[PDB]
Design a protein around this ligand. Sequence first.
Ligand SMILES: NCCC[C@H](N)CC(=O)NCCC[C@H](N)CC(=O)NCCC[C@H](N)CC(=O)N[C@@H]1[C@H](O)[C@@H](OC(N)=O)[C@@H](CO)O[C@H]1NC1=N[C@@H]2C(=O)NC[C@@H](O)[C@H]2N1
Lengths: 63, 117, 52, 104, 88
Amino acid sequence: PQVKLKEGEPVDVAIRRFKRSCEKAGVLADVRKREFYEKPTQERKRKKAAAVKRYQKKLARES
Amino acid sequence: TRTVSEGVAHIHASFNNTIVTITDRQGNALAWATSGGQGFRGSRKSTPFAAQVAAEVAGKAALDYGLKNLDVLVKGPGPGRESAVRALGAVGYKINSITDVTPIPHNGCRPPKKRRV
Amino acid sequence: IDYKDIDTLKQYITENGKIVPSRITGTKARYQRQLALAIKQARYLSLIPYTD
Amino acid sequence: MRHYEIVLLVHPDQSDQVVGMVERYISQIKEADGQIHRLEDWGRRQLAYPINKIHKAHYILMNVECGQSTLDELEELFRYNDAIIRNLIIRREHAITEESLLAK
Amino acid sequence: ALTNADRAEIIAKFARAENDTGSPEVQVALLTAQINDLQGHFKAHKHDHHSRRGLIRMVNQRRKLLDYLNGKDHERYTALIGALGLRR
RNA sequence: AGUAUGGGAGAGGAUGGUAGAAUUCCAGGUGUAGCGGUGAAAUGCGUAGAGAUCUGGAGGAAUACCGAUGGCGAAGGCAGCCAUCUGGCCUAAUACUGACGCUGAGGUACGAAAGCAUGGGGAGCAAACAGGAUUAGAUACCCUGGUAGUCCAUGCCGUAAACGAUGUCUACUAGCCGUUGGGGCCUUUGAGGCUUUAGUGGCGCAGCUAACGCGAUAAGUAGACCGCCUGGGGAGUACGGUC
Ligand SMILES: NCCC[C@H](N)CC(=O)NCCC[C@H](N)CC(=O)NCCC[C@H](N)CC(=O)N[C@@H]1[C@H](O)[C@@H](OC(N)=O)[C@@H](CO)O[C@H]1NC1=N[C@@H]2C(=O)NC[C@@H](O)[C@H]2N1
């Protein structure tokens, strides 16, 4: 992140630029994933469902 | 007694508690307050309001050491990070930077088992 | 790609130092594999940082 | 034989010794057999991250062609020499002679 | 491993004609050389089963070609097994 | 069906070395009352100083991002980087052998995880077990700990919803839209468009099916060989035998 703040930037606006920086980074998603161990079977099922959803989205947006 | 002008604010936010530690640069601690200290026992530790109160207390305590501009680092998920950093600014500090430093393994140790609730 | 091509490597690296996925930059798969290998070799050689 | 590309990182305090070691490595390669197709000295570069609490290092780039015994000897020398803090060895097809980037 | 020169020497020695690379003699000689070469590898890498599968395939192919040559011409079969040292 | 020669992609296998992040422990600097945990709590840790924060050490295990309805392998399976040894596959055109083929009862090789034997290792996790909760009871789900094991070397065991619940090989039968590795052709300066081939996906005509559905990766149309089924329980059990 390293959100450095300008002379005219208010404290609240600086914090807002910050949560956008961190939401773009998506570190909290990794933190959520790390907290409990997920079995390889469940991981494979999750990725399979994600791929199916991505292909459905592609088809829907194309037509 | 010792006078410092620049400082660092460490926010340890979790799903259970928030800890605010004010250090000088080079990491030597000056003041610290947590949601547990200001009442809010048990489940009440994790609310953003308790984090705001703890951050205000820590900033007021560091003002005696007398530093005016600080750099904040946020480590951890959970409520209270944004409220705590807002409270530090509302005390009268000038925040110089704000960044996330939560540790992320490169697939290291195995996490605990999933809870079946 | 080659690992000494540091500016081109930085073209495909975010500000955290993470590698950008192919879906975002429109890269070909074969070119992306070489780019990732070059990035890892440069990281080991310390021409670009691992993190940050 | 086979073609290899070698990158050496040298402690800046011992940069005065780089010429001697590179001459002796090239001499070993030549007396055994093979060629040197590229020698480059990138100079005193800053590191992206510290290695053994050091922030700068001397970079040497070699493109050579040599045999298995020579490769083993060079690896042993790089391992046991203390001026060398990191080394990378990469097999290549065909010999590269053109002046690389990062030479400056 | 064997090189192009080594393979060319075997092909030249066992060739039955000009540019003959497909005869059972040439094929069996090439397979025998490769099998004898790989025994050094499998001495130091005893637990490499994935490559041992390919080695077994080479052995089976040599056996099939030897049986075919024995069926076609017995004299050529005996000459080839004698020249290569195979027991059968 | 196979061989020689050029070129190409790959987490295919075996051995050794090495890099960065993180967890745990140890020592030290700052510093002072909590920390941790839950639905709420408690067991537990802390004024011989915890938690937090900074610097430095020790050790083990696993490789974020790339990452993909992607890739490789007979299957089981295979992901940081580098070197060494090594198997298969794809692709072009010539040259060569001349049916050398397909399948396969017995047999034999490999074969997740757990488990066993001998010797090492042990960070994290965690059967058994201990304590705290919940409950009418709780032997469990939740919480704090924690041994075998998970890791390495050398062997054994031979079982999984080992699944596409779909044996292997061959030929033929509308089309449309993706994607991976190659070959060819065309535009015209560099990126696009047509084809062709080997994989991997989504629809879908005919045909098939009890229906669901399958539909050139068939469960369609045919041929070769093998394995298996004959109501539900008793029962993959008893006796005998092999290991
Ligand atoms: N030449 C060699 C090539 C080898 C390679 N294998 C290629 C090949 O040969 N393929 C053959 C296709 C057969 C296929 N396996 C049968 C099938 O697909 N379902 C089994 C029939 C059950 C039932 N009659 C249909 C059914 O319930 N459907 C569901 C359904 O649509 C949907 O579920 C929900 N909740 O809405 C979806 C989302 O999960 O899941 C499907 N279920 C599944 N989708 C999976 C899938 O395709 N595979 C693996 C497994 O996971 C499959 N189950």
